[PDB]
Amino acid sequence: KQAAADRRTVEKTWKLMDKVVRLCQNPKLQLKNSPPYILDILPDTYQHLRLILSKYDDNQKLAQLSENEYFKIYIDSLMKKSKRAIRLFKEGKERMYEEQSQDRRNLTKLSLIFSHMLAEIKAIFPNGQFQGDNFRITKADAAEFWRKFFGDKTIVPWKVFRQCLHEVHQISSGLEAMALKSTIDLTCNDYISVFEFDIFTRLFQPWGSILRNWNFLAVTHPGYMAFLTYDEVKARLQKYSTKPGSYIFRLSCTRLGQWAIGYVTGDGNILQTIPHNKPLFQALIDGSREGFYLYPDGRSYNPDLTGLCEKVTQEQYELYCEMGSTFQLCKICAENDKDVKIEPCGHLMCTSCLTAWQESDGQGCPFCRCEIKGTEPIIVDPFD
Ligand SMILES: Cc1cc(C(=O)Nc2cccc([C@]3(C)CCNC(=O)O3)c2)nc(C2CC2)n1
Ligand code: NA
Ligand SMILES: [Zn+2]
Ligand SMILES: [Zn+2]
């Protein structure tokens, strides 16, 4: 449960965000000015919160704002992520000044989360006023699914979302559900907002085959580059500037819900196209036919996508999850966090999954089958 998001609670997030900005201003970090840039995002998040407060301009309106389900979750998540960034610096020490460290990679994961939370609050409280209950999902067939299972909710727990999505599009494993959570839960708060749902269904449309589109285009396609800036697209394609037709497709933290396809022209330049609210596989098929998109990430083989007009290893899901924040999630159910450690193997899972395995007379540890000599309750952090 989350506390009421009253003025005092909102101001506590500002004080935590101020500490994060000051830690990130350390000259030793050499933090680059490129999206997601925490030094721009946190001041812009304070400004949007200030704008919301200015619209709920009396004690009656403040009381209604403080009990809004989405706003309580947002403020609780912002508090947690800001505390996590402070803890990152406290535990990371001198490794924060090494650009290639896992600690600095974790700061990039948090910067992406802050960027996505700012985009989310701007979409749910446009001009500072709550419109979550009136949110217009871009694809009507996706909107009908959200209205059927969640009515006019602005946000729902991941556990409930996953179970309901499975009733329409079957998810075949815990690892697939984990990769799917990492893809949709962009704010990494264990909830799916109607805004996060809108982004996912725009990217992986058409709705009728959404999980096939996602498994093919994001999890296994060699052209997929996840969140990149244009400087990063150029750096990836530069080595293929003498191979016209070399291409990649990326997500953009400043253009959520849209793809950007970077490609090498016949004259060796690197350009990009933003497909116009149409399926990505159709833009890639058309571009292949026209001779523009031939070699994904410069590779000799371009996967045939025509099966998407009318498969994934457990390793492929694992590799896809590396950039995300799902280490704390139980890999067996992909719906509860890891809360038990087995001795002596050290494997982690939720107690509900371990109990189910033991009640089935499963041999030892669910993962490695070794004898369980003891168990211990544990708390797992996404950056452990
Ligand atoms: C260039 C770059 C890009 C990314 C990056 O896109 N992060 C990311 C974070 C969370 C979720 C995702 C999803 C949507 C799902 C899991 N796998 C994906 O490919 O996309 C990506 N991260 C980093 C470093 C690790 C912080 N660097
Ligand atoms: Na979320
Ligand atoms: Zn579990
Ligand atoms: Zn084990």
From Swiss-Prot:
Q: In which tissues is it expressed?
A: Expressed in placenta, heart, lung, kidney, spleen, ovary and testis, as well as fetal brain and liver and hematopoietic cell lines, but not in adult brain, liver, pancreas, salivary gland, or skeletal muscle. Present in lymphocytes (at protein level).
What residue spans carry the region label Linker? 308-329
The entry's localization annotation reads: Cytoplasm
Task: Summarize the PTM comment.
Answer: Phosphorylated on tyrosine and serine residues upon TCR or BCR activation, and upon various types of cell stimulation.
Chain segments carrying region SH2-like: 205-307
Which residues hold 4-O-phospho-L-tyrosine?
Answer: 250
Q: Which residues carry this modification: Phosphoserine?
A: 246
Domain of life, source organism: Eukaryota
Q: Which residues carry this modification: Phosphotyrosine?
A: 320
Q: Where is this region: 4H?
A: 1-131
Q: Which residues are recorded as binding Ca(2+)?
A: 185, 187, 189, 191, 196
Q: Zinc fingers (RING-type): give the ranges.
A: 330-369
Q: From the UniProt entry, list the residue stretches annotated as the region EF-hand-like.
A: 132-204
Q: What induces it?
A: By serum starvation.
The residues covered by the Cbl-PTB domain are 1-307
* Residue pairs linked by disulfide bridges in the UniProt entry: none
Impact noted for substituting residue 320 to E: Decreases affinity for E2 ubiquitin-conjugating enzymes
Describe its assembly.
Answer: Interacts with SH3 domain-containing proteins LCK, CRK and SORBS1. Interacts with LCP2 and ZAP70. Interacts with CBL. Interacts with SH3 domain-containing proteins VAV1, FYN, FGR, PLCG1, GRB2, CRKL, PIK3R1 and SH3KBP1/CIN85. Identified in heterotrimeric complexes with SH3KBP1/CIN85, CD2AP and ARHGEF7, where one CBLB peptide binds two copies of the other protein. Interacts with poly-ubiquitinated proteins. Dimerization is required for the binding of poly-ubiquitin, but not for the binding of mono-ubiquitin. Interacts with EGFR (phosphorylated). Interacts with IFT20.
Disease per UniProt entry? Autoimmune disease, multisystem, infantile-onset, 3: An autosomal recessive disorder characterized by autoimmune manifestations apparent in the first months or years of life. Clinical features may include hypothyroidism, type 1 diabetes mellitus, systemic inflammatory manifestations such as fever and hepatomegaly, and autoimmune cytopenias.
Copy the domain comment. Answer: The N-terminus is composed of the phosphotyrosine binding (PTB) domain, a short linker region and the RING-type zinc finger. The PTB domain, which is also called TKB (tyrosine kinase binding) domain, is composed of three different subdomains: a four-helix bundle (4H), a calcium-binding EF hand and a divergent SH2 domain.
Reported function: E3 ubiquitin-protein ligase which accepts ubiquitin from specific E2 ubiquitin-conjugating enzymes, and transfers it to substrates, generally promoting their degradation by the proteasome. Negatively regulates TCR (T-cell receptor), BCR (B-cell receptor) and FCER1 (high affinity immunoglobulin epsilon receptor) signal transduction pathways. In naive T-cells, inhibits VAV1 activation upon TCR engagement and imposes a requirement for CD28 costimulation for proliferation and IL-2 production.
As a miscellaneous remark, the entry gives: This protein has one functional calcium-binding site.
The protein's name is E3 ubiquitin-protein ligase CBL-B
From what organism does this protein derive? Homo sapiens (Human)
Which span of the entire protein is present here? 37 to 427 of 982
